Amino acid sequence: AASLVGKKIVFVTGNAKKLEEVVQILGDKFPCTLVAQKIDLPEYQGEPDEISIQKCQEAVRQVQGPVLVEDTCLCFNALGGLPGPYIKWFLEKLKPEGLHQLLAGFEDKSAYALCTFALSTPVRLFRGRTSGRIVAPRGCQDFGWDPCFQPDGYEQTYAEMPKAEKNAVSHRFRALLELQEYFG
Ligand X SMILES: O=P(O)(O)OP(=O)(O)OP(=O)(O)OC[C@H]1O[C@@H](n2cnc3c(O)ncnc32)[C@H](O)[C@@H]1O
Annotation: binding site: 13-18, 43, 55, 71-72, 88, 143-146, 166, 171-172
Q: Which residues are annotated as a binding site for ITP?
A: 13-18, 55, 71-72, 88, 143-146, 166, 171-172
Geometric angle at alpha carbon 11, from 174 and 70, rounded to 5°: 45
Q: How far is the CB of 133 from a second copy (least distance, A)?
A: 16
Name the amino acid, one letter, at 117: F
Residues 103-142 that bind ligand X (CB under 6 A): none
- What would you report as the CA-atom Rg of the chain, rounded to the nearest whole angstrom? 16
- Residue 32's binding partner among ligand X, a second copy, none (Cβ under 5 to 8 angstroms by kind) is none
Phi, psi of 164 (to 5 degrees): -50, -45
How far is the CA of 161 from the CAs of 53, 148, 154, in angstroms? 32, 12, 10
Q: How far is the CB of 127 from ligand X (least distance, A)?
A: 13
Q: Is 82 in the site for a second copy (CB under 8 A)?
A: yes
Q: How far apart are CA 181 and CA 115, in angstroms?
A: 16
Helix (H, G, I), strand (E, B) or coil at 127: strand
Residues 22-81 that bind ligand X (CB under 6 A): 40-41, 70-72
Q: How far is the CB of 76 from a second copy (least distance, A)?
A: 10
The residues that bridge with 69 in the sheet, in sequence order, are: 118
Positions touching ligand X (CB under 6 A) are 13-15, 18, 40-41, 70-72, 87-88, 91, 143-146, 158, 170, 172
